[PDB]
């Protein structure tokens, strides 16, 4: 299997995340006009449009780098919206679970493609 293959795999997984309704809050850089204390709580923002731009630009040296970015979207959300009562909390958990389900294989296929 292909050492580059993870690029399309991630392009496609991101396209699936974008298109689903659970990604809505996370598709773009958070608007500070809307959410003005975001930075009091969050040191490093991340959002799926930015992850996709970085991938398209070729600025991920390995899929682990993409993963760190995507997982930051979720840790940010859990830090900024910690309540289980919140619908945003649930959306984030679902989308995270989905992300992690598909990225496993992407990484496992990468690590082992590094041995051929």
From Swiss-Prot:
Protein localization: Nucleus
Residues carrying Phosphoserine: 90
Positions of post-translational Phosphothreonine modification: 44
Tissue: Expressed in myeloma and epidermoid carcinoma cell lines.
Residues of the Bromo domain: 1-106
Function as written in the Swiss-Prot or TrEMBL entry: Probable regulator of the insulin and insulin-like growth factor signaling pathways. Stimulates cell proliferation through regulation of cyclin transcription and has an anti-apoptotic activity through AKT1 phosphorylation and activation. Plays a role in the regulation of cell morphology and cytoskeletal organization.
Disease: Chung-Jansen syndrome: An autosomal dominant disorder characterized by developmental delay, intellectual disability, autistic features, anxiety, hypotonia, obesity, and dysmorphic features.
Assembly: Interacts with IRS1 and IRS2. Interacts (via bromo domain) with acetylated lysine residues on histone H1.4, histone H3 and H4 (in vitro).
Name of the protein described by the UniProt record: PH-interacting protein
Residues included from the entire protein: 1316 to 1431 of 1821
């Amino acid at each position: 299997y292909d050492i580059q293959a993870w690029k399309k795999q991630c392009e496609e997984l991101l396209n699936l995340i974008f298109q689903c309704e659970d990604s809505e809050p996370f598709r773009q850089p958070v608007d500070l006009l809307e959410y003005p204390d975001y930075r009091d709580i969050i040191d490093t923002p991340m959002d799926f449009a930015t992850v996709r731009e970085t991938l398209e630009a070729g600025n991920y040296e390995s899929p682990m780098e993409l993963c760190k970015d995507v997982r930051l979207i979720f840790s940010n959300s859990k830090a900024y919206t910690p309540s289980k009562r919140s619908r945003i909390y649930s959306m984030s958990l679902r989308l995270s679970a989905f992300f992690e389900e598909h990225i496993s294989s992407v990484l496992s296929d990468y690590k082992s493609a590094l041995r051929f």
